[PDB]
């Protein structure tokens, strides 16, 4: 089970969620980012370092936004067969950790866009507001984040996280 | 260390917090409850059974609001000497559990009103926005909630939870 502090990194953002990797680094999927705004979390966009590609968006703020957190390891996906937890927060406050057996890392075309992602099989599914939720796993003594929720098939049995 | 599901019961409400004891029962303190609203969590006030006893307020909703939750043990305070955790969330999303060594249950005047509460000694103090946070402890294998945060002395050393 993921520690409470790890869940506390999952933050409402735009039309979904994002995740604090460190006091200054926030990750989410590109579709949930709000547009037509001049600030994120009260910080002007010109003050934020941004890397956005393949449906993965990373922000690095110029001040400590979550000084309570330790910077954790972000990896580009995980080994095939890893069982990740998708840390889904629902608007009720429910915490819904979904177990996913991860498959291949690949570039895919989803609704006409290039996603650099990893597919996995859900072990009762994700919904539109869940985009941005982190995929995490425990390696030895440390938690690792390796993607953010981006898509699922119509049946709902398969999910895709964007990776960086 | 409280599990994530226990933290997920801590819910922003009014000027502070409240706590889901069960899918239908929500507790908070009287001073946190907002006036001039027509709804709580989308439910009209007239559809909720609201019980106020001194500084303790409980809502019983007529629909399942948190059907993910099991109903837990709500006790009228705890044994003297128990070290509780007060499950405080701060505005950033930071989790700030505070340890409190509990003292006596009593009827005490706080700002002119006789409150049924349990005092304790904090072991980085509490702030106005923390009212309604739950006082919890683990008894054997089960977590127990025994009050909600209501007050603190000017010095900050003594806290009071309202009990029912
Ligand atoms: C701002 C709008 O976007 C959002 O709402 C983000 C939240 C939802 C979450 C989905 C929503 C439902 N269940 C879920 O888990 N995501 C999407 O809708 C994505 C599309 C799908 O999930 C589709 N899946 C595939 O095409 C698909 C193909 C494969 C493989 O896996 N999924 C449909 C389920 C809509 C949006 C998207 C489009 C192009 C991309 F580059 C990347 C993403
Ligand atoms: C609208 C106000 O609502 C709120 O903000 C609720 C949150 C704060 C949290 C305090 C705020 C600061 N640090 C804290 O932890 N609570 C209070 O302010 C309470 C008053 C006190 O804390 C006072 N304490 C005592 O009198 C007192 C006596 C003993 C014993 O312990 N505390 C003062 C700290 C203001 C409000 C109250 C009044 C009459 C009652 F029936 C019962 C409660």
Author numbering:
A (entry chain A), B (entry chain B): 0 to 122, 132 to 172
Paper text:
The protease plays a crucial role in viral replication by cleaving the polyprotein into individual nonstructural proteins. HuNoV proteases are cysteine proteases structurally similar to picornavirus 3C-like proteases with a chymotrypsin-like fold. Their active site features a catalytic triad with histidine-30 (H30) as the catalytic base, cysteine-139 (C139) as the catalytic nucleophile, and glutamic acid-54 (E54) as an acidic residue which orients and stabilizes the conformation of H30 (15). The substrate binding pockets S1 to S4 in the HuNoV protease, which accommodates the P1 to P4 residues of the substrate, are in the cavity between the BII-CII loop (beta strands BII and CII, residue 102–117) and the DII, EII, and FII beta strands of the second beta-barrel.
We chose rupintrivir, a previously reported nanomolar inhibitor of human rhinovirus 3C protease, after confirming it to be a potent inhibitor of GI.1-Pro, yet simultaneously a poor inhibitor of all GII-Pros tested. The GI.1-Pro – rupintrivir complex structure shows excellent pocket complementarity accommodating the P2 to P4 residues of rupintrivir without undergoing any significant conformational changes when compared to previously determined apo GI.1-Pro structure. In GI.1-Pro, the modeled rupintrivir molecule introduces minimal steric clashes with the apo protease structure, except for the P1 glutamine mimic, which is readily accommodated through the slight widening of the S1 pocket. In the crystal structure of GI.1-Pro, the BII-CII loop is in the open state, stabilized by a hydrogen bond between histidine-115 (H115) and glutamic acid-75 (E75). In GI.1-Pro, the H115-E75 hydrogen bond is positioned in the middle of the BII-CII loop, effectively stabilizing it. In the NV-004 bound structure, the loop conformation results in a narrower S2 pocket and a wider S4 pocket, suggesting that in exchange for stability, the BII-CII loop matches its conformation to the bound ligand to attain the most favorable conformation. These comparative analyses affirm that the S2–S4 substrate binding pockets are more flexible in GII-Pros than in GI.1-Pro, in which the S2 pocket is constrained to an open position by the H115-E75 hydrogen bond. The estimated covalent inhibition rate for GI.1-Pro is at least 50-fold higher than for GII-Pros. Surprisingly, rupintrivir shows no significant change in covalent inhibition potency against any of the GII-Pro R112A mutants compared to their respective wild types (WT) while showing lower potency against GI.1-Pro R112A compared to GI.1-Pro WT.
